[PDB]
Amino acid sequence: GTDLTDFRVATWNLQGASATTESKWNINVRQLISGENAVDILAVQEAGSPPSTAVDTGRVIPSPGIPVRELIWNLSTNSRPQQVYIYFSAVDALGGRVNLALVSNRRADEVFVLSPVRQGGRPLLGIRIGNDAFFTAHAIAMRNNDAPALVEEVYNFFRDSRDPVHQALNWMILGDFNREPADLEMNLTVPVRRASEIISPAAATQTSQRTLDYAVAGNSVAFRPSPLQAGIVYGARRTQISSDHFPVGVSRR
């Protein structure tokens, strides 16, 4: 119990494309995951292609026909955070504008790959570190979209586990839900509402003043609210990155 507060996590839709993401990874993602205020886990949407120097470990990951690879990314041989692990899903083997990733400063103990909940939707990619699981999500930009069903899929996945320790993992879904926080909350079933909390920043997370990028923390057997808060990473700076979404960080209030 009392888990998620040990981690600084974040989510960023970097609006990347497979052919041109080198700077967004080698500069912008690198800055989020290293240095004095590094996040431990970063969820990425529209991830493009991973850094050219990150190398597949060959880890065998069970998956229901969804591409997923573990890569090691060596960042330095001095700077405290020396290497990180990337879990990358090429969603399209074609244009590549809706790929997903998780970056972590610890190897994943377990990797989760859950199927899309709607035709044309993205899968859910998650990792477990100890008693906590973290997912990256990218709901469809449409009216009345798949965000509630994505959250419901994660809640049911853990509830249905045969192992009681897996049923009680603390989970967090970080992503671009493509609807505002209250709009997601009101469209969840009663048991999922009572078993989770939405953690969202007070500010807009994209340039159109909408709050679309945030986190849902939950536990499928015994939920207790966590003292977590979300904020805009770099909210105090005027940034010139080629994404219309801002990174959103989550950690203890």
Side-chain angles (χ1 to χ4, degrees), residues 8-61:
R8 287 180 40 84
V9 307
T11 176
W12 190 30
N13 175 336
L14 62 79
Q15 286 196 323
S18 34
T20 177
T21 8
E22 290 144 61
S23 290
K24 283 167 176 187
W25 279 92
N26 195 45
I27 313 291
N28 307 302
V29 168
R30 179 190 283 269
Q31 282 15 115
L32 278 300
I33 66 159
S34 53
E36 296 292 291
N37 298 105
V39 313
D40 302 308
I41 290 158
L42 175 65
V44 187
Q45 307 85 36
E46 303 188 30
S49 282
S52 62
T53 59
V55 178
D56 198 331
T57 57
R59 177 172 183 164
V60 313
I61 299 168

Side-chain angles (χ1 to χ4, degrees), residues 103-151:
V103 191
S104 31
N105 58 16
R106 295 190 68 121
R107 175 188 187 278
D109 299 323
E110 192 171 15
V111 187
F112 304 123
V113 192
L114 317 183
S115 297
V117 187
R118 189 174 291 200
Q119 242 184 99
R122 262 71 67 167
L124 284 163
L125 163 67
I127 62 177
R128 181 180 58 80
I129 292 157
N131 200 62
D132 300 304
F134 299 92
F135 290 75
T136 180
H138 183 194
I140 298 161
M142 70 190 281
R143 296 302 176 124
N144 293 286
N145 76 358
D146 58 332
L150 290 166
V151 176

Side-chain angles (χ1 to χ4, degrees), residues 83-115:
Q83 301 195 123
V84 292
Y85 285 84
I86 301 177
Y87 297 87
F88 201 98
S89 297
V91 167
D92 316 302
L94 268 87
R97 266 175 292 261
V98 300
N99 297 332
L100 292 163
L102 283 158
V103 191
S104 31
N105 58 16
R106 295 190 68 121
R107 175 188 187 278
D109 299 323
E110 192 171 15
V111 187
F112 304 123
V113 192
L114 317 183
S115 297

Side-chain angles (χ1 to χ4, degrees), residues 5 70 117 241-242:
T5 68
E70 176 181 74
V117 187
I241 311 174
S242 208

